[PDB]
């Protein structure tokens, strides 16, 4: 019965986990060589 | 006459059979170490320069340097610009950077009678000095190089004499007034002297270095806004002509200062565009006197816009109205 909605609230749940990661993957100071010398 | 002819023929023979190898078993990489073994210095270098390989060129140059008499080294290397260029540059880099083989440049530039390049070396020395007394001694040497020719080097020599003079007067200013002066340019000196109120000395600077009037005015105007001396700014306005106009006096005083003192330069402003006198009174915050000017030029549209700004009642407004 409701054993088809349970996947949807897990699908659309992890969907937002990735988008939250990517928007964090563009987080602050980008990796460079000079940044690692200071 | 003969003793040298044997050389002119022999070496012209060593070259004959040497060129009989740039054909078989070339190129560049292997052929300049070969030529350099056979005491064909001048050919090795030229071959290296043609190759474009900077590192190769160095190798023949470095070899020539310790092999040949230095006088002859300079001779050989100065025939070829690209070689002289690199010898010249390296004499500025043997550390690297900073440290200088000045002795090499001095000797090199003298042999080629390169006086500008030689004099320039001494100017570089004058900058490194801690005392202006020893700094002036370096400039003297620079000047002494240029005193021979004389023609063409007229400006440089004048410039040098100008610089020696400027340092001497600057050294004086420190003794008397207890402040930094040595090192500053002529223009920077007139500025600091005026900002500090020493109006008299500044004029002695202007006179000695033949400072262009239009420049002197621009320096004075800027240096007085610094001192905020609106009184002697006021005193300058009391004459007819200005070599820089009065619009500079307008805009420069208006910026960070009195809208009051600024507006008094209209209508001394000869070079102005029509109906700009109005907007100037506006920027000075004098809406009252602005409307009055709008009328004199018979531009009632400006009279309309200025009254609409106020509003027939506020800021009197009638006073704006009564002027029409």
């Amino acid at each position: 019965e409701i054993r088809n909605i349970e996947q949807g609230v897990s699908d659309l749940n992890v969907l937002f986990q990735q988008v939250a990661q990517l928007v964090a993957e563009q987080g602050e100071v980008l990796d460079t060589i000079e940044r690692n010398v200071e | 006459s003969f003793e040298v002819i044997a050389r002119t023929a022999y070496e012209e023979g060593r070259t004959r059979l040497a060129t009989e190898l740039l054909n078989h078993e070339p190129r560049a990489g292997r052929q300049v170490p070969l030529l350099l073994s056979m005491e064909e210095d001048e050919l090795a270098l030229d071959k290296a320069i043609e190759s474009g390989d900077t590192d190769l060129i160095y190798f023949v140059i470095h070899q020539l340097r310790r092999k040949l008499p230095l006088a002859s080294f300079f001779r050989v290397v100065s025939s070829r610009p690209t070689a002289s260029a690199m010898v010249e540059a390296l004499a500025r880099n043997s550390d690297g950077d900073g440290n200088e083989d000045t002795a090499l440049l001095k000797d090199l530039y003298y042999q080629d009678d390169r006086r500008l390049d030689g004099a320039s070396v001494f100017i570089r020395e004058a900058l490194q000095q801690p005392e202006t007394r020893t700094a002036s001694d370096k400039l003297d040497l620079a000047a002494n190089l240029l005193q021979g020719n004389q023609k063409e080097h007229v400006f440089e020599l004048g410039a040098l004499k100008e610089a020696k003079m400027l340092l001497r007067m600057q050294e004086t200013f420190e003794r008397d007034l207890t402040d930094s002066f040595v090192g500053l340019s002529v223009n920077q000196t007139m500025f600091k002297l005026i900002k500090l109120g020493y109006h008299g000395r500044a004029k002695k600077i202007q006179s000695e270095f033949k400072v262009p009037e239009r420049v002197a005015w621009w320096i004075r105007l800027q240096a007085l806004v610094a001192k905020r001396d609106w009184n002697e700014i006021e005193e300058i306005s009391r004459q007819r002509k200005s070599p820089i106009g009065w619009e500079p006096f307008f805009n420069q005083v208006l910026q960070a200062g009195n809208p009051r003192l600024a507006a008094t330069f209209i209508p001394k402003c000869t070079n102005l565009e029509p109906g700009q006198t109005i907007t100037m009174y506006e920027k000075c915050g004098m809406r009252v006197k602005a409307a009055e000017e709008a009328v004199r030029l018979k531009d009632t549209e400006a009279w309309n816009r200025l009254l609409e700004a106020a509003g027939r009642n506020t800021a009197e407004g009638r006073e704006i109205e009564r002027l029409g």
């Binding site: 990796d31 690692n36 010398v37 | 190759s51 590192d55 100008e162």
Partner: protein, 605 residues
């Protein structure tokens, strides 16, 4: 099967990493500062850690840590300074050490004889694992290759150092070795000819090698994926880099200064911004005239907000799943827009001041062909008002370069202005501008312009901008900048002489169209021989013996963002039949040029 800028990046990274493998175990890294930047274009510091790097150190910092045992050096090998610098550090760490340390040196791009001699005359040569890192072109974009030799302009035109020409030749030769001989080597200018001559000398040595059993299998034939290479010498057109650039990226370089696709700003000490073609917004903004940036900036803000609202319609998994899909791409675009709104804002303030407009006013008159004496009062004002020395000197050099010298009476005054204005040290500064032949008296043989009426004479006659202003339509006042119809948009009415020369090769029909009126061939300088003759240096077209091919436009001695944008403007017009790829020794501008000449010593305490 054609040329791809990505294969350059890949080779560069792979060549670097294969040398890091060679030193087994973990290692501490030491890099030449003005080499770290360019390296960041081919490799991540992330990737470097994976290959065993603990701490990073600039060579010019003199603080290499004794942490790890292996010490790896990466510096350009042609540099006299770098050789001494490393040797000095190998003694600072051999007489302050606690362990023996393994010392590795990766010379870019090669181990030089000089390098060894400096290392030898320090004893530390024996304790040195010396390898070669054949880095040449750093691919800054898919269509931009640069050697990233920052001091190449000073080196070449002031010091008369053939190193940049040598490297660039080798770099270009690398392209030939992979993709075949350039069918045509077309060029203009002295150093363009030197590059071409080295390309022919190196070719013969490859044929002398393969013939004499050095093998290498083969054996080079004309390319099938390359139309030609066009080489322009920077000393042919000093004017274009002297002018204040008016494109968005140009003005950014003019005010913020762009290095290695990056820059510094204060309000997003200060922070570092990345500036390259990845960011979809910057792509459209960079090559555009700064005027229409507002029009463009808003339009993108106008489209983003009504692209976030949209598509909550079909509230069925997908059309939201698809919305959340395009969600990180919105946020990025949103933060990009906020940055380039701030940046655009700062630049708008720079361009509104008096001094800027006074400068640009002078620039416009000189360019257009007004009598430079009319601009004398303006220049004098600018010196008197203590406007920055680089900008004043650029007006002076622009004056000299575009009018074939300065009148001898006006010249003596300008010199007085500079000396008294900024300090007598600049007796040297003016001497250097004289050596660069960018600031000469009209009574100097070197200052004369190429004329086909003024008899013969003159070995290094200068570019005649007076003749070329009309004959190559250097002025276009028509140009609309919302939808630019011609490269002259980059300077709001003035097309760079350099890129007009390229158009004499590539877009011949169009050029005649904007002059008098009304593939396969005809290639070369054909039909424009007399016009190009009035530009400095040798004109040449060496020949070495289907569908759209690539064309390399090479700048020896620096290129400007304006010239890059202009070239991109043409690349689009030619997108069908040609792929235009830009190469250069460095990326240059007016301030970098002046810095080559300006003496910084000071007569002070």
């Amino acid at each position: 099967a054609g040329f791809d800028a990505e294969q350059v990046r890949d080779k560069a990274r792979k060549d670097l990493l294969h040398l890091l493998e060679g030193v087994r175990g973990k290692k501490n890294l030491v890099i030449e500062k003005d080499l770290a930047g360019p390296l960041g274009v081919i490799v991540k510091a992330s990737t470097l850690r994976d290959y065993g790097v603990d701490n990073f150190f600039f060579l010019e910092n003199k603080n290499t840590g004794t942490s790890q045992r292996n010490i790896v050096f990466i510096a350009r090998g042609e540099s006299v300074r770098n050789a001494h610098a490393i040797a000095a550090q190998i003694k600072r760490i051999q007489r302050e050490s606690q362990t023996s340390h393994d010392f590795h040196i990766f010379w870019v791009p090669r181990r030089t004889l000089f390098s060894d001699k400096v290392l030898e005359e320090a004893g530390v040569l024996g304790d040195a694992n010396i390898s070669e890192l054949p880095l040449y072109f750093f691919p800054l974009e898919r269509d931009v290759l640069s050697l990233e030799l920052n001091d190449s302009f000073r080196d070449l035109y002031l010091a008369k150092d053939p190193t940049p020409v040598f490297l660039l030749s080798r770099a270009l030769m690398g392209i030939q070795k992979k993709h075949g001989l350039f069918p045509r080597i077309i060029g203009k200018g002295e150093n363009a000819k030197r590059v071409a001559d080295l390309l022919s000398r190196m070719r013969q040595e490859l044929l002398a090698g393969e013939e004499a059993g050095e093998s290498d299998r083969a054996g080079l034939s004309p390319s099938t994926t390359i139309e030609s290479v066009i080489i322009i010498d920077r000393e042919v057109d000093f004017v274009t880099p002297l002018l204040t650039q008016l494109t968005y990226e140009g003005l950014i370089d003019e005010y913020f200064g762009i290095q290695n696709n990056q820059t510094d700003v204060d309000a997003v000490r200060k922070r570092k911004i990345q500036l390259d073609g990845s960011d979809s917004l910057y792509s459209q903004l960079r090559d555009a005239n700064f005027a229409i940036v507002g029009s463009l900036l808003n339009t993108v803000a106008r489209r983003l907000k009504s692209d976030y609202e949209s598509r909550h319609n079909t509230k069925t998994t997908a059309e939201l799943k698809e919305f959340v899909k395009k969600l990180p791409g919105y946020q990025a675009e949103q933060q990009s827009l906020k940055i380039h709104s701030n940046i655009a804002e700062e630049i708008i303030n720079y361009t509104r001041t008096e001094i800027f407009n006074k400068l640009l006013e002078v620039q416009q008159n000189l360019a257009a062909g007004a009598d430079p004496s009319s601009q004398f009062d303006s220049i004098e004002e600018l010196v008197a008002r203590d406007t920055p020395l680089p900008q004043v000197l650029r007006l002076l050099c622009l004056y000299s370069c575009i009018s074939g010298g300065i009148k001898t009476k006006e010249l003596d005054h300008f010199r007085r202005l500079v000396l008294q204005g900024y300090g007598h040290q600049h007796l040297l500064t003016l001497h250097n501008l004289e050596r660069l032949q960018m600031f000469l008296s009209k009574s100097s043989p070197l200052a004369s312009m190429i004329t086909m009426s003024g008899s013969s004479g003159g070995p290094d006659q200068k570019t005649n901008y007076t003749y070329l202003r009309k004959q190559l339509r250097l002025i276009v006042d028509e140009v609309n900048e919302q939808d630019p119809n011609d490269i002259a948009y980059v300077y709001s009415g003035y097309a760079p002489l350099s890129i007009r020369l390229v158009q004499c090769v590539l877009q011949k029909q169009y050029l005649l169209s904007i002059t008098k009126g009304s593939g396969g061939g005809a290639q070369g300088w054909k039909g424009f021989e007399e016009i190009v003759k009035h530009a400095r240096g040798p004109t040449f077209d060496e020949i070495q013996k289907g569908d759209k091919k690539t064309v390399f436009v090479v700048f020896v001695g620096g290129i400007t963002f304006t010239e890059i944008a202009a070239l991109r403007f043409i690349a689009k017009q030619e997108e069908a039949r040609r792929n235009i790829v830009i190469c250069t020794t460095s990326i240059i501008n007016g301030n970098r040029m002046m810095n080559a000449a300006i003496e910084t010593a000071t007569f002070e305490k």
